[PDB]
Amino acid sequence: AQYEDGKQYTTLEKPVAGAPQVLEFFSFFCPHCYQFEEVLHISDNVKKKLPEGVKMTKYHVNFMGGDLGKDLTQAWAVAMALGVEDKVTVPLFEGVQKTQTIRSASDIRDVFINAGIKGEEYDAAWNSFVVKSLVAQQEKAAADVQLRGVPAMFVNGKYQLNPQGMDTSNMDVFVQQYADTVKYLSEK
Numbered sequence: 001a002q003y004e005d006g007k008q009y010t011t012l013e014k015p016v017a018g019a020p021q022v023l024e025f026f027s028f029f030c031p032h033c034y035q036f037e038e039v040l041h042i043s044d045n046v047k048k049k050l051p052e053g054v055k056m057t058k059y060h061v062n063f064m065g066g067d068l069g070k071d072l073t074q075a076w077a078v079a080m081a082l083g084v085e086d087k088v089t090v091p092l093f094e095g096v097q098k099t100q101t102i103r104s105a106s107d108i109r110d111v112f113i114n115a116g117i118k119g120e121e122y123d124a125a126w127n128s129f130v131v132k133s134l135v136a137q138q139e140k141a142a143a144d145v146q147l148r149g150v151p152a153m154f155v156n157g158k159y160q161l162n163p164q165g166m167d168t169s170n171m172d173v174f175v176q177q178y179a180d181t182v183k184y185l186s187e188k
Helices: 031-040 042-049 066-082 085-098 105-114 119-127 129-144 171-187
Strands: 009-011 022-026 056-060 152-155 159-161
Touching (some): 022 031, 022 129, 031 042, 031 085, 031 171, 042 056, 042 171, 056 066, 066 085, 066 129, 085 105, 119 129, 152 171
Antiparallel strands (some): 009 159
16 A cells, blocks of 8 residues: 555554544754754645645643743643733744743743734643643643653544654755645545
8 A cells, every 4th residue: 555554644543533633742942853853844835735614733841941831831832821822832943942032931931922922822721721631631632642752743633643764854845745645544
């Protein structure tokens, strides 16, 4: 076949009912995630090839960067609640991995302020129980698939992307292969 289990994807031994349709996990400490966001724009090209009426979900994970990594998961919860994902993703990545000017929760906060989110608005969100449950949601979803690595994509809680089984000669070709694979899995 052209798409084989164990090649462009793997199948979960233990399928996860009720799972989001297209589910992406990342960490701002994760170097391939940086590449995925900044250089390849994986999330974006996938979306463009999905049937519409499809929900696309992206969660942060705790298991990289210790205490700051957990701060980052709460911040990504705030970002989703306020709907400001598209305004903070790039400066959070570059603050963590490029300029390394993110060292504390207050530094994370500064990114949101600079991006035009208001102080009271951020701090209230940060402390809200709506954000607490979105943090819960992120963790539960990672727990469900025993996630130990990122970047990671899951389709219909049953298939997991395997980018190691695609070619990396050309970056654009990689993306289309990745995105086409998700769509195949989506229709499966």
